[PDB]
Amino acid sequence: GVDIRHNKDRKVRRKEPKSQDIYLRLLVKLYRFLARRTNSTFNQVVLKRLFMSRTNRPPLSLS
Amino acid sequence: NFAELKIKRLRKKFAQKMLRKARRKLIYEKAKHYHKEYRQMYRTEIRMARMARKAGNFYVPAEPKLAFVIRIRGINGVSPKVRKVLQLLRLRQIFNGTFVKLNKASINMLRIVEPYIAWGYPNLKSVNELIYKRGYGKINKKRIALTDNALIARSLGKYGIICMEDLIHEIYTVGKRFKEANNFLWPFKLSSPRGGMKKKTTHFVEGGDAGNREDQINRLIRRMN
Amino acid sequence: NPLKNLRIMLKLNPYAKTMRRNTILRQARNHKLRVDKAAAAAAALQAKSDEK
Amino acid sequence: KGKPHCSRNPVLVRGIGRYSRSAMYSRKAMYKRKYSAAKVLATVTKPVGGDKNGGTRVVKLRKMPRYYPTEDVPRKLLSHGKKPFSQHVRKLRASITPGTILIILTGRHRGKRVVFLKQLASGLLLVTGPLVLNRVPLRRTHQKFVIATSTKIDISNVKIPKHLTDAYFKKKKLRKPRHQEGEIFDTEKEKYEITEQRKIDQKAVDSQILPKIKAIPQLQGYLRSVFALTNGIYPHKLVF
RNA sequence: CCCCGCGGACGCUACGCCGCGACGAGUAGGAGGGCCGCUGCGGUGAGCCUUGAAGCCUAGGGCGCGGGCCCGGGUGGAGCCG
RNA sequence: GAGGCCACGCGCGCGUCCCCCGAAGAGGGGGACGGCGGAGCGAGCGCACGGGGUCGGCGGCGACGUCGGCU
RNA sequence: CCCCCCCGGCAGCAGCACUCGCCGAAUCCCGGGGCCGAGGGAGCGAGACCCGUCGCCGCGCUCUCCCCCCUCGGGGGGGCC
Ligand SMILES: [Mg+2]
Ligand SMILES: [Mg+2]
Ligand SMILES: [Mg+2]
Ligand SMILES: [Mg+2]
Ligand SMILES: [Mg+2]
Ligand SMILES: [Mg+2]
Ligand SMILES: [Mg+2]
Ligand SMILES: [Mg+2]
């Protein structure tokens, strides 16, 4: 037996969009490839934002 | 451009091979120098004791600066302070071993977890056996076996430790980067002591196994791994 | 396992080969010296017992 | 090219040479042997013959496969060892020296005492407890399944024939060419035949082993007897 | 400038495939997955079926950790399933 | 001056130290070390304590009696 | 028999006359029994084509020349400044 705690083992985060939008899934494929094969952290941020929900992607006003 | 690119790849491979050869020669000579240092220290202790006895005085050796700590009791019914100190020593399992740099703070922690551990002062042979047979690195939070020197070099080369011999030297003679070298090592997962223990529930000085046995930790290690 | 696998130990520490070779040569020399010294002691005993 | 030389680095322990890198450099004289600078036709042209068939034909060897299976198996990795049985080193127990009396533990010659002659290329022992004594011909046996006793005869300076090899003693079979389905019994030839060559070899070996057996008293009686376990005796307490 | 050879395994349902490391008790309770199961509806299988459906029986052969499922034999006689 | 060890082995020029004569203790002639200086390249066979097992080893037995089927 | 000697000498030496230790950079060699064999495209090279005998690591021989010791070209050694 090992003296560890298992309540925080599974990190709760989006690994994919919960949406079934096929266009969104295609561009998630594109940015998954770009984030994997480039060192640009911008691609990583964009991919994790694509995974997000609508409340986590609020609309941006023109102003 | 085919001949030119062949020349380019041959030159690159040859430069890489020469670099590997130079690094291997450096590793060999560092190990030789470490051997010289070890025998110098071992003979120096004997010589100092001899001159003190010739003069009729007493030579008190330096208090040991390295300890090996083995957790001997299990994980059931442990008080919170003992549990916390064992976690800070990285002994979360029975028959787990860890090298500890000895000072006031570490010794007081060892006193706190005294009933749960057996600790002592390992010798050069014990350090060699532990690192070579059961040495695993914490590389990218993974337990990776130390099967190549490149694994040590990629994680500790910024500190000058680039081989098994450098790691063993830093562990044995407690160097400047002992904390980094020791935390790089995964805690040793030792077997059950072959031949059994005396009594895990009492102290070593009262016929048991817990607490500080001075240099009998080497006997324990030989039976342990 | 190094300490059991010679080439694995040499991969991790190339100086182990020269240490091991020096140890083997030294042990052979010391064994020969002790054997010769014991044989000389036995021959001296034979001479001092059958010196006539 | 030059004549191959001996190793010049004597082995003192397996994997370790007696001399160091610089010592072997000086022994090899690498200081002056320094060097800086300086197929098979796949297709064959054949005259096809016949008028206006062109000149010749460029016929390739190893034509491409006619058929491909629906799926294959990936090739294995590489193991840097695992030599074939013919290249294995053959180990012999120190108690088995030429002329030792052995005890057979398995087979139809179970419990018989035979004479050891030599180890063969496969590590199998060649024995002949002489056929006039206990009906054991020149025959192979396995050193794992024998007991080496302490009694020995000096079978030095006797001539074991050179053709007595593993290929010589290998079993022979008849079945099964020109026959696929068994409606008529192919049980013929099942009577193994002792070859005249085998009889000649047996006579030649025994004619020079027997006088040395008769040289010591009642060893022939010992070889005629078979080994057995009496109810009082135990193999771990027995000196062989 | 490849060519005496015109040739060169598999893969990548990307919701896929592959690698490495650590870990695995569980009531009340929470969550995920279910190519677990029942009934009916929209699609689809140029699906199955009187040369035998459903159901049932079976010392028959198996698959899955499991929920369960497939196939053989018998009975049955008109519907059934992915 | 009648042994052991070295994971020491190309030249040229540069530096550092040591040696000789030193006719200003100038100037040349020699050793040792170098991490210094603009210029491409070793290949060819093997053995293996070498990124997880192979044999390029073998034997016996097989239809109305036996072989295999951990369910 | 015990102690001090004016002082010892020789051999051995934690003894292969089993009195009493701690050890191994001051440590190596060999052998036996048991359990196991997971993985499966490792080729910067020829532009691969018989199934990559491959990488790292440790070695041997040749592209130099003399000899030495056994076999009858083969095997085993000393090197060669
Ligand atoms: Mg567990
Ligand atoms: Mg839990
Ligand atoms: Mg308890
Ligand atoms: Mg036991
Ligand atoms: Mg208690
Ligand atoms: Mg659970
Ligand atoms: Mg001793
Ligand atoms: Mg396998």
Tab-separated table of N, CA and C in Angstrom, chain D residues 65-168:
chain	number	residue	atom	x	y	z
D	65	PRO	N	6.132	-11.355	-57.582
D	65	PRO	CA	5.190	-12.408	-57.186
D	65	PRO	C	3.918	-12.393	-58.020
D	66	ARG	N	3.407	-13.592	-58.299
D	66	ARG	CA	2.143	-13.714	-59.010
D	66	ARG	C	0.961	-13.394	-58.112
D	67	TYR	N	1.093	-13.649	-56.818
D	67	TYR	CA	-0.004	-13.554	-55.870
D	67	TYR	C	0.473	-12.884	-54.596
D	68	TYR	N	-0.391	-12.067	-54.010
D	68	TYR	CA	-0.128	-11.465	-52.723
D	68	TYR	C	-1.218	-11.888	-51.752
D	69	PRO	N	-0.870	-12.392	-50.575
D	69	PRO	CA	-1.896	-12.712	-49.582
D	69	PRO	C	-2.594	-11.452	-49.105
D	70	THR	N	-3.810	-11.638	-48.586
D	70	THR	CA	-4.626	-10.499	-48.188
D	70	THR	C	-3.989	-9.683	-47.074
D	71	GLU	N	-3.121	-10.286	-46.269
D	71	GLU	CA	-2.433	-9.565	-45.210
D	71	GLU	C	-1.231	-10.376	-44.756
D	72	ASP	N	-0.233	-9.676	-44.228
D	72	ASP	CA	1.041	-10.258	-43.825
D	72	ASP	C	1.305	-10.007	-42.346
D	73	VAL	N	2.450	-10.495	-41.896
D	73	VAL	CA	2.911	-10.351	-40.518
D	73	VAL	C	4.121	-9.427	-40.529
D	74	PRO	N	4.189	-8.432	-39.647
D	74	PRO	CA	5.372	-7.569	-39.607
D	74	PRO	C	6.611	-8.346	-39.194
D	75	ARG	N	7.759	-7.890	-39.684
D	75	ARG	CA	9.010	-8.552	-39.368
D	75	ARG	C	9.386	-8.309	-37.910
D	76	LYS	N	10.212	-9.202	-37.380
D	76	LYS	CA	10.597	-9.142	-35.983
D	76	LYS	C	11.640	-8.053	-35.757
D	77	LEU	N	11.861	-7.734	-34.486
D	77	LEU	CA	12.982	-6.898	-34.093
D	77	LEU	C	14.256	-7.740	-34.073
D	78	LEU	N	15.361	-7.134	-33.656
D	78	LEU	CA	16.662	-7.786	-33.674
D	78	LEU	C	17.124	-8.075	-32.250
D	79	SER	N	17.767	-9.231	-32.058
D	79	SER	CA	17.964	-9.801	-30.729
D	79	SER	C	19.411	-9.843	-30.253
D	80	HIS	N	20.373	-9.533	-31.121
D	80	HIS	CA	21.817	-9.485	-30.830
D	80	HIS	C	22.309	-10.710	-30.059
D	81	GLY	N	21.724	-11.864	-30.318
D	81	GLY	CA	22.183	-13.083	-29.691
D	81	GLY	C	21.450	-14.262	-30.282
D	82	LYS	N	21.046	-15.201	-29.430
D	82	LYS	CA	20.188	-16.320	-29.812
D	82	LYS	C	20.778	-17.086	-30.997
D	83	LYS	N	21.975	-17.615	-30.779
D	83	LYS	CA	22.676	-18.345	-31.818
D	83	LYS	C	21.979	-19.677	-32.092
D	84	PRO	N	22.120	-20.219	-33.299
D	84	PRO	CA	21.536	-21.531	-33.589
D	84	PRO	C	22.226	-22.631	-32.799
D	85	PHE	N	21.559	-23.786	-32.736
D	85	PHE	CA	22.048	-24.883	-31.908
D	85	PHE	C	23.411	-25.376	-32.370
D	86	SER	N	23.676	-25.317	-33.674
D	86	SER	CA	24.958	-25.783	-34.185
D	86	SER	C	26.108	-24.903	-33.717
D	87	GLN	N	25.827	-23.652	-33.363
D	87	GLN	CA	26.854	-22.723	-32.916
D	87	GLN	C	26.922	-22.585	-31.403
D	88	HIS	N	26.086	-23.306	-30.662
D	88	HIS	CA	26.149	-23.256	-29.211
D	88	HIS	C	27.443	-23.885	-28.715
D	89	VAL	N	27.940	-23.376	-27.601
D	89	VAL	CA	29.088	-23.980	-26.940
D	89	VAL	C	28.626	-25.231	-26.204
D	90	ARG	N	29.442	-26.278	-26.249
D	90	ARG	CA	29.095	-27.562	-25.656
D	90	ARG	C	29.834	-27.715	-24.336
D	91	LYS	N	29.083	-27.928	-23.262
D	91	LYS	CA	29.635	-28.052	-21.923
D	91	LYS	C	29.585	-29.505	-21.478
D	92	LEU	N	30.661	-29.958	-20.847
D	92	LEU	CA	30.765	-31.321	-20.358
D	92	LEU	C	31.056	-31.291	-18.868
D	93	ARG	N	30.377	-32.153	-18.118
D	93	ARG	CA	30.598	-32.225	-16.682
D	93	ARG	C	32.009	-32.712	-16.391
D	94	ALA	N	32.618	-32.148	-15.347
D	94	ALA	CA	34.005	-32.465	-15.028
D	94	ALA	C	34.194	-33.917	-14.616
D	95	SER	N	33.134	-34.587	-14.175
D	95	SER	CA	33.229	-35.985	-13.786
D	95	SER	C	33.216	-36.935	-14.973
D	96	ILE	N	32.972	-36.437	-16.178
D	96	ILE	CA	32.901	-37.263	-17.375
D	96	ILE	C	34.166	-36.997	-18.179
D	97	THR	N	35.126	-37.908	-18.081
D	97	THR	CA	36.357	-37.904	-18.846
D	97	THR	C	36.424	-39.179	-19.678
D	98	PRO	N	37.158	-39.180	-20.793
D	98	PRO	CA	37.179	-40.368	-21.658
D	98	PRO	C	37.674	-41.603	-20.920
D	99	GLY	N	36.883	-42.669	-20.994
D	99	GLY	CA	37.148	-43.884	-20.257
D	99	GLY	C	36.335	-44.055	-18.997
D	100	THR	N	35.533	-43.064	-18.628
D	100	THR	CA	34.713	-43.163	-17.432
D	100	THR	C	33.586	-44.165	-17.639
D	101	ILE	N	33.280	-44.922	-16.593
D	101	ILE	CA	32.128	-45.812	-16.614
D	101	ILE	C	30.899	-45.008	-16.220
D	102	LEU	N	29.931	-44.931	-17.122
D	102	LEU	CA	28.691	-44.212	-16.894
D	102	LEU	C	27.550	-45.191	-16.678
D	103	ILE	N	26.477	-44.691	-16.079
D	103	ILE	CA	25.266	-45.466	-15.851
D	103	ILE	C	24.141	-44.805	-16.630
D	104	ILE	N	23.517	-45.560	-17.523
D	104	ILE	CA	22.416	-45.042	-18.324
D	104	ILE	C	21.160	-45.002	-17.468
D	105	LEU	N	20.434	-43.887	-17.526
D	105	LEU	CA	19.237	-43.727	-16.717
D	105	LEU	C	17.937	-43.835	-17.498
D	106	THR	N	17.969	-43.704	-18.821
D	106	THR	CA	16.763	-43.713	-19.634
D	106	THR	C	16.954	-44.620	-20.840
D	107	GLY	N	15.840	-44.988	-21.464
D	107	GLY	CA	15.875	-45.791	-22.667
D	107	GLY	C	15.843	-47.277	-22.394
D	108	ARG	N	15.988	-48.044	-23.476
D	108	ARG	CA	15.966	-49.495	-23.365
D	108	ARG	C	17.202	-50.039	-22.667
D	109	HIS	N	18.281	-49.262	-22.611
D	109	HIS	CA	19.492	-49.643	-21.899
D	109	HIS	C	19.540	-49.050	-20.506
D	110	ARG	N	18.376	-48.918	-19.885
D	110	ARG	CA	18.235	-48.309	-18.577
D	110	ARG	C	19.019	-49.081	-17.527
D	111	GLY	N	19.817	-48.365	-16.742
D	111	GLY	CA	20.546	-48.967	-15.650
D	111	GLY	C	21.822	-49.681	-16.029
D	112	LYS	N	22.193	-49.693	-17.301
D	112	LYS	CA	23.393	-50.388	-17.736
D	112	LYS	C	24.618	-49.505	-17.562
D	113	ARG	N	25.758	-50.147	-17.344
D	113	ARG	CA	27.027	-49.457	-17.175
D	113	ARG	C	27.812	-49.547	-18.474
D	114	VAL	N	28.175	-48.391	-19.019
D	114	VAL	CA	28.815	-48.290	-20.320
D	114	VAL	C	30.112	-47.505	-20.170
D	115	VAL	N	30.884	-47.460	-21.251
D	115	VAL	CA	32.184	-46.803	-21.277
D	115	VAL	C	32.076	-45.550	-22.131
D	116	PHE	N	32.510	-44.418	-21.587
D	116	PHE	CA	32.474	-43.153	-22.303
D	116	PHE	C	33.717	-43.001	-23.167
D	117	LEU	N	33.521	-42.563	-24.408
D	117	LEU	CA	34.619	-42.394	-25.347
D	117	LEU	C	34.902	-40.930	-25.658
D	118	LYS	N	33.917	-40.193	-26.160
D	118	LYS	CA	34.142	-38.800	-26.511
D	118	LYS	C	32.811	-38.077	-26.604
D	119	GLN	N	32.862	-36.770	-26.390
D	119	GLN	CA	31.724	-35.914	-26.663
D	119	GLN	C	31.705	-35.566	-28.143
D	120	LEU	N	30.515	-35.544	-28.728
D	120	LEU	CA	30.369	-35.289	-30.148
D	120	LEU	C	30.135	-33.799	-30.380
D	121	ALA	N	29.859	-33.426	-31.631
D	121	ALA	CA	29.723	-32.017	-31.975
D	121	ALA	C	28.478	-31.396	-31.360
D	122	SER	N	27.451	-32.195	-31.090
D	122	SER	CA	26.224	-31.695	-30.491
D	122	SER	C	26.229	-31.775	-28.974
D	123	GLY	N	27.324	-32.218	-28.368
D	123	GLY	CA	27.385	-32.385	-26.938
D	123	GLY	C	26.924	-33.732	-26.444
D	124	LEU	N	26.361	-34.560	-27.316
D	124	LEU	CA	25.977	-35.903	-26.923
D	124	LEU	C	27.217	-36.762	-26.733
D	125	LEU	N	27.214	-37.558	-25.676
D	125	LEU	CA	28.302	-38.484	-25.435
D	125	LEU	C	28.177	-39.683	-26.361
D	126	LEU	N	29.319	-40.225	-26.764
D	126	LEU	CA	29.376	-41.471	-27.510
D	126	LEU	C	29.877	-42.549	-26.564
D	127	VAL	N	29.068	-43.583	-26.353
D	127	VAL	CA	29.396	-44.618	-25.386
D	127	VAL	C	29.335	-45.976	-26.062
D	128	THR	N	30.128	-46.909	-25.543
D	128	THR	CA	29.980	-48.316	-25.906
D	128	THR	C	30.381	-49.162	-24.694
D	129	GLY	N	29.394	-49.491	-23.876
D	129	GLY	CA	29.558	-50.588	-22.966
D	129	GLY	C	29.588	-51.804	-23.847
D	130	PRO	N	30.754	-52.439	-23.970
D	130	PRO	CA	31.029	-53.277	-25.143
D	130	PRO	C	29.956	-54.329	-25.364
D	131	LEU	N	29.583	-54.503	-26.633
D	131	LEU	CA	28.393	-55.273	-26.971
D	131	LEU	C	28.485	-56.711	-26.479
D	132	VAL	N	29.701	-57.246	-26.350
D	132	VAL	CA	29.858	-58.580	-25.790
D	132	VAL	C	29.590	-58.603	-24.294
D	133	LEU	N	29.561	-57.443	-23.639
D	133	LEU	CA	29.400	-57.380	-22.192
D	133	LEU	C	27.957	-57.114	-21.781
D	134	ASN	N	27.352	-56.039	-22.290
D	134	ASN	CA	25.996	-55.709	-21.872
D	134	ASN	C	25.106	-55.261	-23.026
D	135	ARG	N	25.449	-55.624	-24.262
D	135	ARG	CA	24.594	-55.411	-25.432
D	135	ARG	C	24.313	-53.932	-25.689
D	136	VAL	N	25.303	-53.082	-25.445
D	136	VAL	CA	25.188	-51.660	-25.739
D	136	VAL	C	26.154	-51.342	-26.878
D	137	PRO	N	25.672	-51.034	-28.068
D	137	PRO	CA	26.569	-50.768	-29.192
D	137	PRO	C	27.186	-49.380	-29.068
D	138	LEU	N	27.951	-49.003	-30.091
D	138	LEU	CA	28.381	-47.618	-30.222
D	138	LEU	C	27.137	-46.759	-30.355
D	139	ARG	N	26.856	-45.930	-29.359
D	139	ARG	CA	25.545	-45.310	-29.293
D	139	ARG	C	25.673	-43.960	-28.609
D	140	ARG	N	24.876	-43.003	-29.062
D	140	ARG	CA	24.865	-41.696	-28.435
D	140	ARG	C	24.023	-41.723	-27.168
D	141	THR	N	24.308	-40.780	-26.281
D	141	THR	CA	23.555	-40.627	-25.049
D	141	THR	C	23.701	-39.185	-24.593
D	142	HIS	N	22.845	-38.779	-23.670
D	142	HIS	CA	22.848	-37.414	-23.168
D	142	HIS	C	23.496	-37.372	-21.795
D	143	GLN	N	24.420	-36.429	-21.608
D	143	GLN	CA	25.139	-36.331	-20.345
D	143	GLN	C	24.226	-35.968	-19.188
D	144	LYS	N	23.072	-35.365	-19.466
D	144	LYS	CA	22.139	-35.048	-18.398
D	144	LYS	C	21.515	-36.309	-17.824
D	145	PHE	N	21.367	-37.351	-18.641
D	145	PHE	CA	20.661	-38.565	-18.258
D	145	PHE	C	21.609	-39.723	-17.967
D	146	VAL	N	22.826	-39.425	-17.517
D	146	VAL	CA	23.778	-40.448	-17.114
D	146	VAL	C	24.355	-40.073	-15.759
D	147	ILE	N	24.901	-41.075	-15.080
D	147	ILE	CA	25.620	-40.886	-13.828
D	147	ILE	C	27.068	-41.269	-14.076
D	148	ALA	N	27.979	-40.341	-13.814
D	148	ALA	CA	29.403	-40.590	-13.988
D	148	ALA	C	29.945	-41.207	-12.707
D	149	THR	N	30.368	-42.462	-12.788
D	149	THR	CA	30.960	-43.132	-11.645
D	149	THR	C	32.412	-42.695	-11.481
D	150	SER	N	33.059	-43.194	-10.432
D	150	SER	CA	34.455	-42.869	-10.181
D	150	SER	C	35.423	-43.796	-10.896
D	151	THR	N	35.002	-45.012	-11.231
D	151	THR	CA	35.896	-45.948	-11.895
D	151	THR	C	36.117	-45.549	-13.349
D	152	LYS	N	37.379	-45.570	-13.775
D	152	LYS	CA	37.760	-45.176	-15.122
D	152	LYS	C	38.781	-46.160	-15.668
D	153	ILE	N	38.801	-46.291	-16.988
D	153	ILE	CA	39.856	-47.011	-17.685
D	153	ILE	C	40.584	-46.023	-18.580
D	154	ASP	N	41.865	-46.284	-18.809
D	154	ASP	CA	42.680	-45.399	-19.637
D	154	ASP	C	42.445	-45.750	-21.098
D	155	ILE	N	41.509	-45.046	-21.725
D	155	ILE	CA	41.233	-45.228	-23.140
D	155	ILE	C	42.002	-44.219	-23.989
D	156	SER	N	43.063	-43.635	-23.443
D	156	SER	CA	43.991	-42.902	-24.283
D	156	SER	C	44.654	-43.862	-25.265
D	157	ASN	N	45.281	-43.284	-26.287
D	157	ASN	CA	45.951	-43.958	-27.400
D	157	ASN	C	45.155	-45.116	-28.005
D	158	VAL	N	43.827	-45.020	-27.999
D	158	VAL	CA	42.994	-45.885	-28.823
D	158	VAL	C	42.415	-45.018	-29.929
D	159	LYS	N	42.120	-45.641	-31.060
D	159	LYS	CA	41.721	-44.915	-32.260
D	159	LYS	C	40.208	-44.993	-32.405
D	160	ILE	N	39.530	-43.907	-32.052
D	160	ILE	CA	38.115	-43.757	-32.373
D	160	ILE	C	38.041	-43.343	-33.837
D	161	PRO	N	37.289	-44.055	-34.673
D	161	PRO	CA	37.212	-43.691	-36.091
D	161	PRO	C	36.642	-42.295	-36.290
D	162	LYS	N	37.142	-41.620	-37.325
D	162	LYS	CA	36.771	-40.227	-37.555
D	162	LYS	C	35.335	-40.090	-38.039
D	163	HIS	N	34.836	-41.060	-38.804
D	163	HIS	CA	33.487	-40.953	-39.343
D	163	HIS	C	32.408	-41.137	-38.286
D	164	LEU	N	32.766	-41.537	-37.069
D	164	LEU	CA	31.785	-41.700	-36.006
D	164	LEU	C	31.317	-40.338	-35.517
D	165	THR	N	30.320	-39.768	-36.187
D	165	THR	CA	29.878	-38.408	-35.924
D	165	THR	C	28.375	-38.385	-35.680
D	166	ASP	N	27.869	-37.180	-35.415
D	166	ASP	CA	26.438	-37.001	-35.213
D	166	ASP	C	25.660	-37.358	-36.469
D	167	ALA	N	26.187	-36.989	-37.637
D	167	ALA	CA	25.559	-37.396	-38.887
D	167	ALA	C	25.586	-38.907	-39.050
D	168	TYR	N	26.630	-39.558	-38.540
D	168	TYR	CA	26.696	-41.012	-38.583
D	168	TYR	C	25.598	-41.636	-37.734
